């Protein structure tokens, strides 16, 4: 491993409005992008919210569905985007992005980054 | 963001414990993967042990595994490292670290953004 994810430590957003948190990475030679997954928060532990495979982008639970859109033009860019804030929003976000080597082993990486949300 | 101070190195005999204490400056500390590094002389920095923002969830090197512990006081911000069984191979300065990863990549120094001044051990033949 492995390209660097950039990510901020925390991210602002206005209840009811929407607002992006970013993880973006260069890509690197040798690290093929195959899973990517946005998790959130719950207790001691962290939960799936957002995966993308082989077969597209799937939001894991309803109360997310048409509420989350994660980036996919830019290589390297899976950053999430979060559409109408709820104050139960407020959470530590995580970016986990698993690449695959020329061995045909996997490297995953992640990063948590806090989301705010105001008004 | 975080300012790390290391404590408690010292001399300790072979055979014997010694722990470890790392205070974490900062407000988001529930954020940051926490980890211990070390280095000798002559040799480069590795790898001893992390712990996880939820303050159970641990890692640790196949040279510790079975000897040291490490633990988190999420409330007062700050990480330990019990050490028992040391060997002179032991001997090294020891780092707190701190690093915005959640379960992976606590093993390799580049997923660490924050380093302490790090705190000398030596264990005696």
């Known amino acids: 491993g492995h390209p660097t994810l950039k990510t901020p430590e925390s991210v602002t957003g206005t209840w009811k409005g929407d607002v992006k948190i970013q993880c973006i990475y260069d890509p690197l030679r040798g690290y093929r992008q195959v899973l990517v997954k946005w998790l959130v928060r719950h207790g001691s532990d962290s939960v799936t919210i957002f995966l993308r495979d082989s077969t597209g982008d799937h939001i894991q639970q309803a109360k997310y569905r048409g509420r989350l859109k994660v980036s996919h033009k830019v290589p390297g860019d899976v950053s999430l985007q979060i559409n109408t804030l709820q104050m139960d929003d407020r959470n530590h976000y995580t970016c986990e992005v698993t690449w695959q080597t020329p061995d045909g082993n996997q490297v995953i990486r992640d990063k948590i980054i806090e989301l705010r949300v105001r008004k | 963001q975080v300012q790390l101070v290391e404590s408690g190195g010292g001399l300790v005999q072979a055979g014997g414990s010694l722990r470890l204490s790392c205070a974490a400056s900062g407000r988001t500390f529930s954020s940051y993967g926490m980890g211990w590094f070390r280095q000798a002389p002559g040799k480069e920095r590795e790898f001893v042990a992390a712990i996880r923002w939820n303050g159970g969830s641990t890692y640790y090197a196949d040279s510790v595994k079975g000897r040291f512990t490490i633990s988190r006081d999420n409330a007062k911000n700050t990480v330990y490292l019990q050490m028992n069984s040391l060997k002179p191979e032991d001997t090294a300065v020891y780092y707190c670290?701190?690093?915005?990863?959640?379960?992976?990549?606590?093993?390799?120094?580049?997923?660490?953004?924050?380093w302490g001044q790090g705190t000398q051990v030596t264990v005696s033949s």
């Open positions: 670290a701190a690093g915005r990863w959640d379960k992976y990549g606590s093993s390799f120094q580049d997923e660490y953004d924050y």
